[PDB]
């Protein structure tokens, strides 16, 4: 019985492909903001995939940019989640 | 949670957490400094050391050094670790990250830890979290 | 109660509002849930002065937190010379471990702090110390470029 | 207050980028075999990621291929899911 | 399951699901059959209509009617559904699949449900199940 | 008990089963937790002598399976011309709709079953149904390039 050399990754992309990942100079990357905040509360009872999920949400819902350049301002973001897990993840 | 469909978590050690911090990079490739990032680093390292990894935080670092660092890592003995996780927080572009002197493909990153090629991880979790531009597209939103 | 005040107090570096705290009755010792102390916090953060308020208090030089962090470590990793030379004079553990087995001396040849580095040597500090992965402060040292470093542990190792 | 335009899209691959897709001739893609099976069992009861890593470990686990050609023989499969979902969902 | 995090599936109807069959392909392609993908189609049928889909099938679409139905249910109203549903049951190579006369970027078929090109789907999940191959790579597998 | 062994028997399109378990008292209505019933599967199927034997024992013609789907759907979606004859000429409702709103009108245009189109229009189908989509049988015809059928509902609405 074998396993593929390609299962059990995953990758948490701060944004999806094609697109800009916004950073607050002063408070830090959007993505890592959210991941904290929701491994912080969450971290020790949730599954991965629901902690990510609601890495989605925040980044999705709590964040817009801002700037003076009209082209650069009121944008928004969403992270990418690919898995290629075999198991349900928790940090027990 | 019914036990046959979680990872198992049983082992001596959560595991290795690796941070890559760039901030600061070589004038040649014209990308600036990533003000913020030091604040991100310090972020995580508390957040994931939370969780049980050990954390070890690297900064600035070169393609090359990106490249052992995670070939060494790969090479290390995880029997005894339940998982393994690295956090890479840098510029980049589509299927790329910068290193402090030019790109790298985050695939050639990630296969260290082929189930062929790093024995010790087969079966568990390994986990990227990719801080970087993968484009210059922008989400305008919708009300 | 007067608990978190003395941490956020200590943490934020107000040196009166601590001595204010403790001369009203506020334990030393106090500590997080993650049992990060008012030492541990100053040590990090680099205030000096208070590091002192709470060693005269009888702060618990060699308390670990639940990661297995005393506050030389703290100090060692930030990389503030002059508090780990106040703890290591006041008792604490030079070769303390934590759960991943780093010691004072993996945390300082990792930061590339040499003169804490120097230190710690001095102090005792065991060269040799494998941390959970097998690996010494040496090994350390040569994986983050810290070349004067790795030089100055392989020359204390023999 | 706005939403990002690509967010809420999940995409379950069958197979990871750049990897050959396994189909039997006579009972299917393993991927979609999985897909049923798993969905005709817990589909109404479990989340959609906890569906698809179910999924994923299906096929990692229950498939590898058969030939007399030497170069397609005991190849094995991992599908790949891409998440920009902001909730979990149930098909509830 | 705490209702503040889950999609609200408090709709009319849970939605369509809409499935490319595609089984023959036109010569000038130098695809085979895909023997076995009926038996594909008729599963999906049964276990996405079992979840209370609306399920629909197509079978052998050349590239113009793929993207003229996906485009077309995109203008559809689901004020009252709850989530969209499209599953691709075809050749493929990377990005890309394969319509009955060749091949058509996957990410033109699902750019019609865009948030801002697909209102009533805004909030509401868009699921797409690709079984197509994405290049000619292997998986050797480990014991 | 019996009344998989019905369904089963049914499905497989075992005659002579299906005869044994009826004469030994099987529940000629008995369904599946999907409210599948055997005269269902026996439409899907195609197998047209047992469902004039299910529709001896008085099989309900019209049952509703979860879905709101008949067995007149089912045989017209399957394409069974003949079976869709025999179950209009026992009372099926032409013009059943299920819970998104398809007749079986809509499942031969979608299907393309030319023939069963003109038997359902002939028991009097209504060209102008709409399924919940807001689709009629026509829009389904054009949708999937079913032309002949797409001109003959349209003649058939005026």
């Given amino acids: 019985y074998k396993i593929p050399v390609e299962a059990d990754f995953l990758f948490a992309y701060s944004t999806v492909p094609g697109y800009y990942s916004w950073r607050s100079p002063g408070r ?12 912080e509360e969450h971290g020790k009872d949730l599954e991965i995939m629901q902690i ?3 890495v989605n949400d925040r980044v999705a819902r709590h964040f817009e940019s801002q700037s003076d350049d009209p082209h650069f301002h009121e944008k928004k973001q969403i992270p990418c989640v690919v898995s290629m897990l075999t198991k349900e993840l928790y940090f027990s | 949670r019914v036990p046959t469909y979680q990872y198992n978590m049983n082992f001596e050690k959560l595991g290795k ?27 995580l390292f508390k957040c994931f050391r939370s969780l049980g990894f050990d954390v070890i ?13 995670l070939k060494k890592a790969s090479e290390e003995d995880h029997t005894n ?10 510029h980049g572009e589509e299927n790329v990250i910068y290193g402090k002197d030019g790109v790298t493909p985050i695939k050639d990153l990630t296969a260290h830890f082929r189930g062929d090629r790093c024995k010790t991880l087969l079966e568990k979790p390994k986990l990227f979290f990719i801080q970087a531009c993968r484009g210059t597209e922008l989400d305008d939103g919708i009300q | ?22 001369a009203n009755g506020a334990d030393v010792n106090a500590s997080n849930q993650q049992g990060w102390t008012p030492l541990h916090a100053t040590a990090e953060y680099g205030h000096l002065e208070i590091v002192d308020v709470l060693l005269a208090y009888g702060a618990d030089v060699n308390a670990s937190d639940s990661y297995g962090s005393t506050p030389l470590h703290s100090a060692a990793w930030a990389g503030h010379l002059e508090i780990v030379d106040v703890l290591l004079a006041h008792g604490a553990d030079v070769n303390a471990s934590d759960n991943y087995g780093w010691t004072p001396l993996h945390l300082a040849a990792h930061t590339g702090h040499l003169e804490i580095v120097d230190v710690l040597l001095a102090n005792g500090a065991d060269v040799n110390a494998n941390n959970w ?8 040292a040569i994986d983050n470029g810290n070349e004067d470093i790795a030089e100055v542990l392989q020359k204390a190792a023999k």
Same sequence: chains 1, 4.
Wanted: aromatic share 8%.
């Fill in chain 2, 81 to 90: 670790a339940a998982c393994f996780a690295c956090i890479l927080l840098s």
């Fill in chain 3, 1 to 22: 109660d007067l608990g978190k005040k003395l941490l956020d107090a200590a943490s934020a570096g107000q040196d009166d509002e601590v001595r204010i705290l403790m």
């Fill in chain 3, 133 to 140: 992965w097998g690996k010494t402060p040496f090994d350390l």
């Fill in chain 2, 17 to 43: 957490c690796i941070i890559i911090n760039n901030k600061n990079f070589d004038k040649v490739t014209g990308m600036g400094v990533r003000n913020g990032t030091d604040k991100d680093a310090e972020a």
């Fill in chain 1, 28 to 39: 830090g990357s959007w993505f890592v903001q959210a991941l904290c905040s929701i491994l």
């Fill in chain 1, 52 to 54: 990510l999920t609601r």
């Fill in chain 2, 57 to 69: 935080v690297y900064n600035d670092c070169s393609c090359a050094k990106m490249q052992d660092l």
